[PDB]
Amino acid sequence: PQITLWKRPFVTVKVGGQLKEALLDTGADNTIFEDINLPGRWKPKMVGGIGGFLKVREYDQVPIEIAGHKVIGTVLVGPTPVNVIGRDTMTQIGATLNF
Amino acid sequence: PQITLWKRPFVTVKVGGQLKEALLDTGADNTIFEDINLPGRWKPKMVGGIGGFLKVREYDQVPIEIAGHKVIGTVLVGPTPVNVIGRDTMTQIGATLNF
Ligand SMILES: CC(C)(C)NC(=O)[C@@H]1C[C@@H]2CCCC[C@@H]2CN1C[C@@H](O)[C@H](Cc1ccccc1)NC(=O)[C@H](CC(N)=O)NC(=O)c1ccc2ccccc2n1
Ligand SMILES: CC(C)(C)NC(=O)[C@@H]1C[C@@H]2CCCC[C@@H]2CN1C[C@@H](O)[C@H](Cc1ccccc1)NC(=O)[C@H](CC(N)=O)NC(=O)c1ccc2ccccc2n1
Ligand SMILES: [Cl-]
Ligand SMILES: [Cl-]
Numbered sequence: 311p312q313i314t315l316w317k318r319p320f321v322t323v324k325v326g327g328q329l330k331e332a333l334l335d336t337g338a339d340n341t342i343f344e345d346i347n348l349p350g351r352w353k354p355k356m357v358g359g360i361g362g363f364l365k366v367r368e369y370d371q372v373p374i375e376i377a378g379h380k381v382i383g384t385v386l387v388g389p390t391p392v393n394v395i396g397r398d399t400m401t402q403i404g405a406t407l408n409f
Numbered sequence: 410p411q412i413t414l415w416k417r418p419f420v421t422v423k424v425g426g427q428l429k430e431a432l433l434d435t436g437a438d439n440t441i442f443e444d445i446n447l448p449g450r451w452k453p454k455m456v457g458g459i460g461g462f463l464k465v466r467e468y469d470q471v472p473i474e475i476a477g478h479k480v481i482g483t484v485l486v487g488p489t490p491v492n493v494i495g496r497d498t499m500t501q502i503g504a505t506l507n508f
Contacts, residue, residue, distance in 0.1 A: 313506040315496040334506055336418055337434025337493055360458020360489055383463055395414055395437060399412040400508070407412040407433055409476065409504035 312408075318375055322351065324375040325385065330393055338396030341374070342386040348372060356387060375376050379403045410476065411507075419486070422494065423474040424484060429492060435506055437495035441485045444492065447471060454485060463487050478502040 313319050319334040326346045329404030333388045340357055352367040376395065378393075381402040412418050418433040425447050431440075439456055451466035463485025473480050475494065480501040 313508065315435060315500045315504060318438075318496070319506055323426070333436050335434070336414055337432050337436050337438030337491075339417070358490070360456065362460025364459050367446055383428055386487050391438075391457070396416070399460070401414050403508050405414055405506060405508040406420065407414070407418060407435070409410070409478075409499070409502045409505060 317354075320379045321395065325372065332393035332395045334400065334405070335394045335396055336400070337403075338394050339398060340386055340396045341394060341399045342366060342388060342390050343385065343393045344385060344388070346385075348385065348387065351394050352387070355388060357388075364390060366390075374399060374405055416421070420475055420494070423472075427469060430492045431492035433499065433504070434493040434495055435499070437493045438497065439485050439495045440482060440493065440498045441465065441487055441489045441495070442486065442492045443486075443489050445486060447484065447486065451486070456485065456487065465489075473498055475502055 320331045348369045349395050352369045355366050355368040357364045366386040369385045372385040418432050448467045451468050454465050454467040455462050465485040468484045471484040482498050
């Protein structure tokens with residue numbers, strides 16, 4: 311699809327077997343969710359942004375379906391106010407900005 | 410242009426009289442700079458991000474040039490780690506996210 315930006319660009323994704331919504335974010339390096347439970351091991355990571363840093367769990371090679379496509383990549387989990395799909399995932403579905 | 414997302418999507422912008430660079434950020438509501446100086450009075454404003462809330466200066470009706478499109482918008486000046494072009498400016502140049 312072609313998405314205008316008059317509203318925040320959320321999309322449906324499936325991760326860990328659950329349907330979630332997340333913000334398509336061209337400014338973010340990373341992909342992060344609040345309250346999803348993933349299997350397998352994780353490693354601690356800190357991510358920074360406006361206002362400071364977030365302590366998260368990093369899970370590697372996680373399948374995400376976004377809203378229709380299969381991506382495998384890194385997923386962060388921590389107490390974020392919003393789920394975000396960052397460039398690490400969006401490059402794998404060929405997302406582009408156009409103007 | 411049509412911009413892929415393998416690198417961070419920075420663009421050249423002229424804000425006030427000054428050439429700067431900033432991140433095209435579909436996950437940001439606002440346009441925020443740290444390294445510009447704008448004249449005159451400003452209004453206090455608070456913005457949120459992943460880590461908490463920051464105090465910024467709001468300057469109204471500021472000219473912004475990006476990719477040859479000259480627009481007039483609200484520019485915030487605050488302790489952001491990265492200059493960001495948010496959806497408020499991107500909608501004015503007709504930017505879309507596509508996949
Ligand atoms: C933006 C922030 C998330 C705070 N990250 C950083 O500031 C990291 C932190 C790292 C650990 C501590 C020591 C410094 C390194 C490198 N910095 C990068 C920082 O010092 C450096 C500033 C700079 C820019 C241009 C020319 C010279 C210097 N940025 C850079 O070199 C490149 C610029 C680019 N176009 O990619 N940017 C980044 O490295 C950077 C990293 C994460 C980001 C996440 C989201 C959005 C933008 C992000 N930009
Ligand atoms: C989410 C995460 C992966 C941690 N990445 C980032 O946060 C990186 C960090 C980078 C270095 C510092 C400068 C910003 C860049 C780009 N950001 C992405 C960037 O897109 C980021 C994503 C985001 C949105 C909403 C809430 C939190 C976080 N947007 C923002 O930080 C913008 C800033 C603003 N006020 O315009 N925030 C918002 O637009 C915004 C909207 C609604 C909100 C509701 C509650 C609380 C905070 C809310 N913030
Ligand atoms: Cl959700
Ligand atoms: Cl990020």
